[PDB]
C-alpha cells in the first residue's frame, strides 16, 4: 500500500523513535502548583477535608434508605436455582451453515460447546441448554439434538424437518466432564456414572410430550402425531430415512459419552482405554 511506501523513505524505526497512539495516555496531576495545591481539591477544613467522612450509605443519622425498606425474598435461593443457557434455532442454523456444528452426527452439549456455539458455566449453576423457538420459521435443517430443556414450538421445528430431539438431564458433576472432556481424561480417573434427576425434575424427563430421555418410548408416536396436527405439518416417517440409525442413536441414561461406558480409563498418551475386570467394580458401574 501507499503507507508502506512512506516507510521506505522515512528513517529507521528504533527504540529512540517510539511514540504512543495520540491521546492514549492521560496526564496525572500532582498537588504541587497553585492551581492544584493549597487546599488540594478537598475544600475548607472539615470532616470531608481531613478524610474522615462517614461510610457509604450513611445519611447523617436518619435511618438510611437501604435499611428502611422491608426485607423481601427477591434473591432467596438464587445460588440454588437451576440455569439453562438458551439456544435459538437461528443460532443453531447459523452454526450448521458455516460448518461449526456438523449435522451428520448426533448433536450433544459437547459438540455445541466444542463449536463455540454456546458457553456453559457449571460454576455459575448452568445445568444445560434450553432450546428457544426463535428462528423456527426459517429453520430448514434435519438434525438429531439432545438438550436439557426444550419448548413445544422448538420441538415442532426440529421434528417437522424430520429430525429428532430428546431431553436429557446431566448432574452438576457430569456436566463439567461433558463440557470439557479432555481436561478430565488427563486427570487419570475412571469415567463416573451419570446420576438421575432430582425428585422435582423426574416428571419432566419421564414425560413423552417433553421428549424425556426416561420417558416411555411407546408413547412417543402419539405425542409426535399430536404436535404435527397442531402446527399443521405432516409427520415424516424417519425409519425410511437413510440415516435412521444416526437419528435414533441415544446414549444410556447412566452414560455421559456415546461410545464410552462408565468406569473406563482413557490413556490418551497410549491411545488406549483401560477397562476393569473386577465383579464388584463392574456391578457398581453397570448399576
Amino acid at each position: 500500500g501507499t503507507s508502506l511506501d512512506l516507510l521506505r523513505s522515512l528513517p529507521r524505526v528504533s527504540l529512540a523513535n517510539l511514540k504512543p497512539s495520540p491521546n492514549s495516555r492521560k496526564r496525572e496531576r500532582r498537588p504541587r502548583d497553585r492551581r492544584r495545591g493549597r487546599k488540594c481539591g478537598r475544600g475548607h477544613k472539615g470532616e470531608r477535608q481531613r478524610g474522615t467522612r462517614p461510610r457509604l450509605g450513611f445519611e447523617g443519622g436518619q435511618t438510611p434508605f437501604y435499611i428502611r425498606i422491608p426485607k423481601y425474598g427477591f434473591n432467596e435461593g438464587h445460588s440454588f436455582r437451576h440455569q439453562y443457557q438458551p439456544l435459538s434455532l437461528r443460532r443453531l442454523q447459523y452454526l450448521i451453515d458455516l460448518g461449526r456444528v456438523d449435522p451428520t452426527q448426533p448433536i450433544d452439549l459437547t459438540q455445541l460447546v466444542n463449536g463455540r456455539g454456546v458457553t456453559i458455566q457449571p460454576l455459575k449453576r448452568d445445568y444445560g441448554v434450553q432450546l428457544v423457538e426463535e428462528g423456527a420459521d426459517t429453520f430448514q435443517a434435519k438434525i438429531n439434538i439432545e438438550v436439557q430443556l426444550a419448548s413445544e414450538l422448538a420441538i415442532a421445528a426440529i421434528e417437522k424437518n424430520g429430525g429428532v430431539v430428546t431431553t436429557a438431564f446431566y448432574d452438576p458433576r457430569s456436566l463439567e466432564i461433558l463440557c470439557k472432556p479432555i481436561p478430565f481424561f488427563l486427570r487419570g480417573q475412571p469415567i463416573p456414572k451419570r446420576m438421575l434427576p432430582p425428585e422435582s425434575l423426574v416428571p419432566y424427563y419421564t414425560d413423552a410430550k417433553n421428549r424425556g430421555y426416561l420417558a416411555d418410548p411407546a408413547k412417543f408416536p402419539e405425542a409426535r402425531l399430536e404436535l404435527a396436527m397442531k402446527f399443521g405439518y405432516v409427520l415424516p416417517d424417519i425409519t425410511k430415512d437413510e440415516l435412521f440409525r444416526m437419528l435414533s442413536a441415544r446414549k444410556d441414561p447412566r452414560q455421559i459419552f456415546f461410545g464410552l461406558a462408565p468406569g473406563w480409563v482413557v490413556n490418551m498418551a497410549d491411545k488406549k482405554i483401560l477397562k476393569p475386570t473386577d465383579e464388584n467394580l463392574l456391578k457398581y458401574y453397570s448399576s
Binding site: 443457557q85 438458551p86 426463535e134
Partner: protein
C-alpha cells in the same frame, strides 16, 4: 341520494335513481335517467342516511348530461353531488319534498356487492387512537412493575444473540 358513501371520495353522494320530467302525481311517466340500485351500506360503517328529495319542475328540460347508461353497474359512475346538479337547473328546479331513512349493513348488502357491483365487499371497523403514555424514562422512579409493559410492542420473549 345516500349522502354518505362513495368509499373513495369523502365529499360525494351516490344517486340510487333519478326520475326526471315526472308529470304530475303519476311517477311511471318519469324519464328513468338512473335505474334503481339496492342499498349497499358497507359492514361496520355505521348508519348511512338516505334521503328522498323532490324538486318542482317548471319547464321540461332534457337532462342529457345527467342521464346514465341503463343498466349502470359501474358504481364509480354513480358519483354525484347535488349542489352542482341543482346549480345547473336551479332556474327550473326548486325543492319541495323530503323523506329520509338510515340503514345498517345486512346480508343483502353482500349480494349487491358481489352479484351486480361485481367486486369484493369492503369491511370497516371502528378504530380508536392508541392510549396516551408520557415519554418513557430510563429510571421510572416510584412507578410499579406495570410501567415496563406499557411501552413494549411484542408480547413474546426475544433472545437476541442467544
Amino acid at each position: 341520494i345516500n349522502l354518505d358513501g362513495h368509499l373513495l371520495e369523502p365529499d360525494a353522494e351516490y344517486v340510487h335513481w333519478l326520475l326526471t320530467n315526472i308529470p304530475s302525481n303519476r311517477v311511471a311517466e318519469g324519464q328513468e335517467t338512473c335505474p334503481y340500485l339496492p342499498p349497499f351500506p358497507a359492514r361496520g360503517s355505521g348508519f348511512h342516511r338516505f334521503a328522498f328529495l323532490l324538486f318542482k319542475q317548471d319547464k321540461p328540460i332534457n337532462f342529457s348530461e345527467d342521464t346514465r347508461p341503463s343498466p349502470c353497474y359501474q358504481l364509480a359512475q354513480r358519483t354525484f353531488r347535488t349542489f352542482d346538479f341543482y346549480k345547473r337547473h336551479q332556474e327550473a328546479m326548486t325543492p319541495a319534498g323530503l323523506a329520509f331513512f338510515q340503514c345498517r349493513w345486512d346480508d343483502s348488502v353482500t349480494h349487491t356487492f358481489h352479484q351486480l357491483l361485481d367486486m369484493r365487499e369492503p369491511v370497516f371497523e371502528f378504530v380508536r387512537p392508541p392510549p396516551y403514555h408520557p415519554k418513557q424514562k430510563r429510571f421510572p422512579h416510584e412507578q410499579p412493575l406495570r410501567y415496563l409493559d406499557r411501552y413494549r410492542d411484542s408480547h413474546e420473549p426475544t433472545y437476541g444473540i442467544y
